[PDB]
Amino acid sequence: TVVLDDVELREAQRDYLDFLDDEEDQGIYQSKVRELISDNQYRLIVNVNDLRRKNEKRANRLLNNAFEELVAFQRALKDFVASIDATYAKQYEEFYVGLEGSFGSKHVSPRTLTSCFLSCVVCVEGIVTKCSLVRPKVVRSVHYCPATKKTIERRYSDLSVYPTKDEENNPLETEYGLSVYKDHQTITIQEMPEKAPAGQLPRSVDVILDDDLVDKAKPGDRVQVVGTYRCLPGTFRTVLIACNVKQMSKDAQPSFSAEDIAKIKKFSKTRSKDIFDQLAKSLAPSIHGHDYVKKAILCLLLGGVERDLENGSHIRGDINILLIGDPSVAKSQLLRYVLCTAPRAIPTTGRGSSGVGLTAAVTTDQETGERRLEAGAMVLADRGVVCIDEFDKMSDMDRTAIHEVMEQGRVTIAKAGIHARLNARCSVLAAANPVYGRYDQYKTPMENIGLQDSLLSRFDLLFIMLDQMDPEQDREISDHVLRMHRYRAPGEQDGDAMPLGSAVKMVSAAFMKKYIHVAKIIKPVLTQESATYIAEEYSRLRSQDSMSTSPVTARTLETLIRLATAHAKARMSKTVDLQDAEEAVELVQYAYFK
Amino acid sequence: TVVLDDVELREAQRDYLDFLDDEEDQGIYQSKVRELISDNQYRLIVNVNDLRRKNEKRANRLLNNAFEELVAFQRALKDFVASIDATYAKQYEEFYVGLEGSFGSKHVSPRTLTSCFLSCVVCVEGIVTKCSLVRPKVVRSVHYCPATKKTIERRYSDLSVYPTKDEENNPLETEYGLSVYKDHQTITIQEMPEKAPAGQLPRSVDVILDDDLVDKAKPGDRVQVVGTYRCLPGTFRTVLIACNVKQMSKDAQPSFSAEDIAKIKKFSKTRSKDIFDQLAKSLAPSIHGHDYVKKAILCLLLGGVERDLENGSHIRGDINILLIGDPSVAKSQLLRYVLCTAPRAIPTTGRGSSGVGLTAAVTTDQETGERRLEAGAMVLADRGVVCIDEFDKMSDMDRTAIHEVMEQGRVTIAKAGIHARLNARCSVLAAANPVYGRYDQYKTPMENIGLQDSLLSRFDLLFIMLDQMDPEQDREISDHVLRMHRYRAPGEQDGDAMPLGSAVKMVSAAFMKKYIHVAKIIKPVLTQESATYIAEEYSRLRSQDSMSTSPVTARTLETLIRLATAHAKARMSKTVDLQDAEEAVELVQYAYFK
Amino acid sequence: LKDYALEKEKVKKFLQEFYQDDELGKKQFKYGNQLVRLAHREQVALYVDLDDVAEDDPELVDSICENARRYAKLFADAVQELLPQYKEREVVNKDVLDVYIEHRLMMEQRSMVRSPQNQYPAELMRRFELYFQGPSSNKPRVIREVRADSVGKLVTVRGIVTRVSEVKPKMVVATYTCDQCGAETYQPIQSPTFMPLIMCPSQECQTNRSGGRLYLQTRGSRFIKFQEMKMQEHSDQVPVGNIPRSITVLVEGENTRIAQPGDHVSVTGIFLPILRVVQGLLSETYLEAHRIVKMNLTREELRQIAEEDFYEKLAASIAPEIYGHEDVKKALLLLLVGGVDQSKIRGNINICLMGDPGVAKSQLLSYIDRLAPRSQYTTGGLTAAVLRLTLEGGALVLADQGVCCIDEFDKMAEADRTAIHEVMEQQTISIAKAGILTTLNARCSILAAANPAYGRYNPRRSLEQNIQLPAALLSRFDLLWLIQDRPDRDNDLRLAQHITYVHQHSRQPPSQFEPLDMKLMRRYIAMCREKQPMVPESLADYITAAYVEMRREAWASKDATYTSARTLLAILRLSTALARLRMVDVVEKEDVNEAIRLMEMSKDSLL
């Protein structure tokens, strides 16, 4: 009952070494391992499709059969490194294989990762939510028996259990240096929140990381992982063993269709001057008035351009707007417009997500009493948008952490000895009614809500909307209200309403969503003419600051820079136009000067 | 649970390899392995005292723990052979170590082989009785799995269990070539029958032989084997695993004491001529008369000297005497004297030994239905003496089987598919009453019993004693009988008889037994004078053959030669003497002529 | 792979037969002398330099490096054998333990083969301890770099002690006495916890089956001094985009009480696992301590230093992205170099920056924090604490021999205001969570930044009227700069033009002097700290003349400008600080006058 030779594994191990023997061919993989030797890491990365090219059969065997095939490949890798350099190979107990390239059907998402892929390689894509602490895991424990003068081993691998006494009951003292340990971390992936239907339940998939793969991930990172999906011992829990992890850029790209691109290009080229206002009017058509607000909200979705400097200064491109206004005004309605339209937005309340709240938090699992650093709403909106309602009712700790993320777009945490620093760059669109209703237009907005005089400085814009009891204004609104209410769809007999569904000039919201998604990729840059013009205006606001809203300050200057940047993105104009600075300046004047 | 290093085994193997590394020293063991390599065998022989001299601690370690130390030793031996020649080492999967030399306590007998010796080396000396057939024992079986295209092995060693299916129930085919097999025979040893009390029971010990040790033993051989005494899997059964076997000389020698030698030499040099006659009178002093018979019995005990020629002849030195006479004659009493007197004798009835009979026989075990070659009473008497009573009542199969041993001294058996040719050279003293008593001196000696005249030719001597009603002779015998009756020990009061205990001029039987044993070592050779004298005597006997027992033939000539040789032993003469032949001639004339 | 008995021989050879030509070249068997001291109880610990073993067996040092726990026990047992040889006096039975050890040894010697259980453990044949000192070849390892692969090895690290528990007695060899038999029982302990024994395994009671129940006795047992502490990544090694990472360290024996929170120590010890299960066991790690030591260019650089505008250029290099505030940028540089502390005098130069929002206060602090060697950033914990029972130094403690940048100074807790008041007074922090006034050394410059209440500053409203902080506490600061965002269309246009360049270039506009890399700046600072310039007594005459002159202006000034002796003391710090910038060990009139100019400008900022 002791295996002697495996012809299949022999051939498979040989074929991998032949594949890694990239000398007569283009030399790419020989150069890789040479770089691997120089770089001192022990995990080669491999494009699966090249393996398909050299051997489709073996590549099929690898994808269909993971655990055995990789073990052969690691063997071929270790021998190959030993061929190039024996001593460097001898430094490391083992070596690892990293897969890459196109995975035809094995490239799935956590929603679509069914049990059918068990023991098959899978290339999952998603967002990391829960992270566990780095821990060292024993694999090969080495023991010494002074009674017998004997040294033994015990591997664990996939497999009271710890041996401490000889079979003769002599003591065994472990040999820590001889034994083998490896850092080990667990995380959880979920489907990207933008592309995740509300009807379906969450489908979260565990992940195991070891060796250098441990720390190459944090919560709120858009990552693609390639690994072997395996069950666990007992209805069985199932986990994915990572073979390689890579952080896809959160920018990604606006795939869509070329027809959408062409329609966008035609629409953009149609009327670049009115595209901003045409979008603005069609941004929230159900809502009447608040035209500056609609213009402002469009700029927030467009977003400025983040500037990372030589010293590491990281002037944010995100724009932040706060809405204050009397109840029964279309504030909550406006945000739901943003949720329907924003390419990547997350809703939230004052209280935030359960337990974790708005920002990240540490969570004992309570199934094993294990710490888990769990991403919050703010982090998940990174390079996106967050819509906060009842923002006044935000808790005090959140009122503390909001300062960090607003200042830095970055939430740090050291609680429970868990050092971490999560990217949280996210334009925020907060809304909060005045306390006790009936805003007094005498004191500060802080005096009506209590924002501690700082977050108002942090917010680039702050718009007040009061229920002025003008009969003309009420007629305009009520005319709009009844016009929408009286509307019936084109195909209908003024009879039945819509069925009780079991599932959840003017431009389409989706068309708007696709358009602004395309526009976000544009990277418009300054013009000296506009730069001179805006400097005059900012100084002019400082001149207009003599009368005494918050005063114009350097925060206001960069706010105008982002707004002109935003309007530049609206027209796809890679050079900021004086029109862009013009529209921003008047918009800011409305914000501070009614 | 994988053993990594055994420092004790590491050092012990090195110590043997250093011991085997016999180049700085006399080269005795280095030469032995070189001779072993030339021999092409794979079992070195080792003297323990060399190990004691080079390392007393290691030798004590070996004898107290035979198994592990030998395994280290065989490890060192194979490594050492590979050092001298790798390919010759590669010929054999393993090598073996044969022990030799002195063992203080561990050199025991089956009588004295206590259970305490378990796991210790032991040098058991004794006599083989039963031998099993040579059978090939499987030790390591190689299997091949065409479904998995995978080879699997198993070792049995000390450990239905023959694997035939993969864990996936794939068929397995056994690679007969790669599998390891070794011939394996079992034998049984017992105490030497001469040196064993009648009160105690047999102490049969089972021996296991493998490889070259298999057929280096036969039933009825005096051997000493060194091996590891071990239990068996299940109150348990215990067997000995042979490490080396050797057939010691069956003659051995009369060590005893130098005082016995001096007394023998003093007595021999006192009256060398009268020692033959004096011994005869003291041979059977309880029986009056038959003095010529007593002389012949002495000649039988001393016997002749075997002559072996260039043609592979084995011209026997043994003497065979038959006694016939009416019942109530001391014939039976004569045999009791010889049994008490002879150095190496064994009694038997006309029936022979139970089951096995006179010569060997094949017996199934009936505990496992296993054939066993069992040595008979005749075989155990090899180079000794056998006393047969009721020889007329021999069974017809035995009446035939006696021919071979009487002629060749070796019994053969090919029956039951079992092939053997055992040694049974044994001077035999047979006796048989005439049928219906009342011997008649008109018919043949055969006709009074029935022997076919082949046996009578085979027997060197035949003596006929008749119940003559001579008042003078009967007075002489009866007066002798009553003198023995009236005789009382010097220490006694004529009162009570000897207690009923549970235990069982004239020279002593023991001293006589010692002397004949010493005389048996002596190898008297021929003298030209006596050779000329006896040749005339034989031709004279041929001249006497004109007158009308058997006629004189060349059988009688060689019978006289052994008789003179036996008398030459009786006086310790290093050569035969005219006295020796002259005593033989009158003895033969008395036998054939009344 | 190797025979520990053979290794035991090599160390015994090494210890008995290693020497070093000591002071005056005295050939001395260093360890041999120490063993003699140990034999007479004159030593307790035996620190061993591996480089000594490297002097004659570097391979042995390597094997010690690849596994250290093994070789520690080998050496300890090796020393255990050697010590009876080196005994030459029957020293007094120091403490009950030695006479107890003597009592047991006589009892054992009163016994001949014996089972391994009926023999004393090695750990009880002690009252000496052994530690290694890492080789100079082994470069110190950052706490981040101590991965799972290095467990079981011997590593040297650097860091800052964030906390340390009180000394407590750790048990080593638990001793028991049977209920009904004279045989004594032992139990070595490795785990942090254990089940105490109940029934004696004594041969007599085992044979008798009397159920002799073990009763623990502390006198028989053997304890050891023990401590628990955490060490944090030193600020230099931390990457900019990360934060410091902790590591537990266990200290025992004579290594105890050699460390306090906020001590920039370097530790050599074994990195090992502890378990207070998936695909194998998961175990928390720690660093068993062995040795603890509390730690402390090109000619063009010299040519640059000789330049008159050198120090001015360095000030320009302070946050060149920040336009304006040049004289303030000069002042920050003075804080970075600090004073001299001639004798003692407060070398740290604490500065507070009050001003309207959106004037680069927070950004300036971030730059200073990134720049200084030992740096801390906080807003308001800041001060020490007693967590549960263990000390835990706050950011103020961690800033020792460095700077603590406190943004949002206006929103401090009033108790913390008192705390920093203690720091500016004597540079120590006192705290009593359980009524125990534990004082901690806090020697760290304070770079405060506050914002006035109710929007921008009102010039009409006096000082301590736009701000609600203690005026006495404010006057403690060496310098106090009031930054006002007055609308000045020209200067406003200048700043905007600076901003637009940065957006259009991701780069500062080109100045007269390009900024220097922050590391090079720190190199100049470290050079500047090398000096401790002195004040000639002639300068004192002019210095005092200037002081009374400005103090007269304060009397002339209707508003009390807080001129005091404190004002004079800081001026000494500024002058000698400037002398350090000048790389001249004697202060100068230019240094003095320039310091007065900045002092006047800070007062002018109050205009």
Ligand SMILES: Nc1ncnc2c1ncn2[C@@H]1O[C@H](COP(=O)(O)OP(=O)(O)OP(=O)(O)O)[C@@H](O)[C@H]1O
């Ligand atoms: N003098 C200046 N030169 C250059 N940039 C400036 C200046 N003053 C302010 N800024 C810019 O103002 C922007 C936003 O204001 P900033 O972060 O400086 O506020 P702050 O003064 O720290 O405010 P607070 O203390 O109220 O939070 C920063 O990006 C900084 O670049």
Ligand SMILES: Nc1ncnc2c1ncn2[C@@H]1O[C@H](COP(=O)(O)OP(=O)(O)O)[C@@H](O)[C@H]1O
């Ligand atoms: N200008 C407006 N045009 C149309 N509807 C409005 C307008 N202002 C308020 N509403 C009405 O207010 C309702 C939503 O109020 P909501 O935003 O939930 O109040 P708040 O946000 O203050 O809690 C909608 O049904 C909407 O019709």
Ligand SMILES: Nc1ncnc2c1ncn2[C@@H]1O[C@H](COP(=O)(O)OP(=O)(O)O)[C@@H](O)[C@H]1O
């Ligand atoms: N010559 C003799 N001298 C002494 N006793 C004799 C003699 N002949 C026969 N006997 C007696 O015969 C008895 C033994 O007879 P046994 O040899 O058994 O008869 P058989 O051998 O014919 O069967 C002994 O008790 C012995 O005393």
Ligand SMILES: [Mg+2]
């Ligand atoms: Mg609402």
Ligand SMILES: [Mg+2]
């Ligand atoms: Mg008879």
Ligand SMILES: [Mg+2]
């Ligand atoms: Mg600030």
Ligand SMILES: [Zn+2]
């Ligand atoms: Zn007891």
